[PDB]
Design a protein around this ligand. Structure first.
Ligand SMILES: N=C(N)NCCN1CCN(C(=O)N2C[C@H](CO)C[C@H](C(=O)Nc3ccc(Cl)c(F)c3)C2)CC1
Ligand SMILES: *[C@@H]1O[C@H](CO)[C@@H](O)[C@H](O)[C@H]1NC(C)=O
Ligand SMILES: *[C@@H]1O[C@H](CO)[C@@H](O)[C@H](O)[C@H]1NC(C)=O
Ligand SMILES: *[C@@H]1O[C@H](CO)[C@@H](O)[C@H](O)[C@H]1NC(C)=O
Ligand SMILES: *[C@@H]1O[C@H](CO)[C@@H](O)[C@H](O)[C@H]1NC(C)=O
Ligand SMILES: *[C@@H]1O[C@H](CO)[C@@H](O)[C@H](O)[C@H]1NC(C)=O
Ligand SMILES: *[C@@H]1O[C@H](CO)[C@@H](O)[C@H](O)[C@H]1NC(C)=O
Ligand SMILES: *[C@@H]1O[C@H](CO)[C@@H](O)[C@H](O)[C@H]1NC(C)=O
Ligand SMILES: *[C@@H]1O[C@H](CO)[C@@H](O)[C@H](O)[C@H]1NC(C)=O
Ligand SMILES: *[C@@H]1O[C@H](CO)[C@@H](O)[C@H](O)[C@H]1NC(C)=O
Length: 340
């Protein structure tokens, strides 16, 4: 027997000894070793209600990544309003690793094994576990990177699809590779390569699905309508450098004669609007050599235009900024219960 409850979680990872990569270093002192023998217990004929938009695990993971980034990605200058601090900012080794979130004695994690689970409402195939799976804490905007994939169809996730102020998480069932490079020897100019055939096939399927939720209306994609570079661009961190990539070529409804390699223009930025809290961090110029990251696009962050009930269209724009939706997109099938 159990009841919905919150408690302090603990983390587990496969961190290595002597490795200087910051995620490894942080997991070495902040987490325990991964469960050598994990085994979930199935709860026969048990239906449970989940709410990925109201999940204290998300808040706790957010706390951890903030602590991780604050211990590892030390900006040269942090203009956090008023006075400014110019601490140490050596170049570091940055590559996220999987982190497990685990419950203490007296608690368990309920796991939604419904393959069409959209993140809210009842779950028919419930299992109990001691730790979540390994979740990579990938910080990004617009595109969710290096995550898990929907096991069946593309899933639409939203706290309330009818309210246009609620972010939509698109969970893909097929990943799309995005290959980003800053060639060696403008040191800040880069480019991301995406296969256009693939991207346009998935993007078409996303419109088909969104049609299902918006009574077969005309689905239109448009670039963000204003804001800072972090959300009008696809932002992410590659080898400790902050990439800002123009996704206009991705969120055009054009696709013809357009089906080759899509080349997104990118910049490595030194001055960043932080995602942890309102403030500005400045880092040193980028490192030498070929900077390259090959990542899987496993989801999209979408915001729907308002003032369209009286039209025949629904316009969708890439979103982002609140990193909790990134953790949400992986924590959606977990919930913490107390053993009564
Ligand atoms: N948890 C709650 N409830 N609020 C937190 C909000 N608090 C306050 C201030 N916050 C902003 O103001 N933000 C707006 C800002 C643009 O002005 C950009 C920020 C960004 O996402 N930065 C970013 C940097 C690097 C990478 Cl790689 C990346 F993927 C993203 C988001 C966030 C946290
Ligand atoms: C229910 O979940 C279990 C894992 O706990 C899985 O093996 C099984 O295929 C699931 N059943 C359905 C119908 O999805
Ligand atoms: C998710 O599924 C539940 C089923 O109970 C439904 O009530 C809810 O509207 C769905 N949400 C979305 C965004 O499809
Ligand atoms: C990228 O996707 C492929 C297939 O979708 C998968 O096998 C691979 O593990 C993924 N890579 C990462 C780093 O998640
Ligand atoms: C992904 O989901 C779409 C529907 O959203 C479906 O048409 C397609 O066949 C699915 N792909 C795979 C590989 O399951
Ligand atoms: C969803 O948002 C719409 C639009 O504001 C609102 O009218 C409706 O009450 C919301 N639904 C719920 C269940 O809160
Ligand atoms: C990524 O792009 C670079 C430059 O275009 C290329 O040299 C490299 O082979 C690519 N790698 C993959 C896995 O696509
Ligand atoms: C792009 O994707 C399509 C379909 O997924 C594939 O057939 C094609 O070979 C890819 N293009 C390149 C240059 O790899
Ligand atoms: C992205 O590129 C398009 C076309 O070159 C341009 O109109 C747009 O201003 C760019 N995005 C930003 C945020 O500057
Ligand atoms: C995604 O995973 C690949 C393989 O592990 C890695 O090379 C890449 O840097 C990751 N991307 C991000 C944005 O962390």
């Amino acid at each position: 027997v159990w009841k919905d409850a919150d408690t302090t979680l603990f983390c587990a990872s496969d961190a290595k000894a002597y490795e200087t990569e910051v995620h490894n270093v942080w997991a070495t002192h902040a987490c325990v070793p991964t469960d050598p023998n994990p085994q979930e217990i199935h709860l026969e004929n048990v239906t449970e209600n989940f709410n990925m938009w109201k999940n204290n695990m998300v808040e706790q993971m957010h706390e951890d990544i903030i602590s991780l980034w604050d211990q590892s990605l030390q900006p040269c200058v942090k203009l956090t309003g008023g006075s400014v601090i110019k601490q140490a900012c050596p170049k570091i080794s940055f590559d996220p690793i999987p982190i497990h979130y685990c419950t203490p004695a007296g608690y368990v994690i309920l796991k939604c094994n419904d393959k069409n689970f959209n993140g809210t409402g009842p779950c028919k195939n419930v299992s109990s576990v001691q730790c979540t799976h390994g979740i990579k804490p990938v910080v990004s905007t617009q595109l969710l990177l290096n995550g898990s994939l929907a096991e069946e169809e593309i899933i639409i996730r939203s706290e309330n699809l009818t309210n246009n102020a609620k972010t939509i998480i698109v969970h893909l069932n097929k990943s799309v590779e995005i290959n980003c490079t800053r060639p060696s020897n403008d040191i800040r100019k880069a480019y991301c390569e995406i296969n256009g055939t693939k991207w346009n096939k998935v993007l078409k399927q996303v419109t088909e699905k969104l049609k299902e939720h918006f009574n077969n209306k005309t689905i239109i994609f448009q670039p963000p309508s204003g804001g800072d570079l972090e959300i009008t661009m696809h932002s992410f961190n590659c080898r400790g450098e902050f990439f800002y990539c123009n996704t206009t070529q991705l969120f055009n409804n054009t696709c013809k004669g357009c089906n080759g390699t899509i080349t997104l223009p990118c910049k490595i930025k030194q001055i960043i609007n932080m995602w942890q809290g309102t403030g500005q961090a400045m880092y040193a110029p980028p490192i030498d050599g070929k900077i390259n990251c090959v990542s899987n696009i496993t989801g999209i962050l979408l915001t729907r235009d308002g003032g369209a009930n009286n039209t025949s269209n629904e316009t969708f724009r890439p979103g982002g900024g609140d990193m909790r939706d990134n953790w949400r997109s992986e924590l959606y099938k977990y919930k913490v219960v107390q053993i009564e």
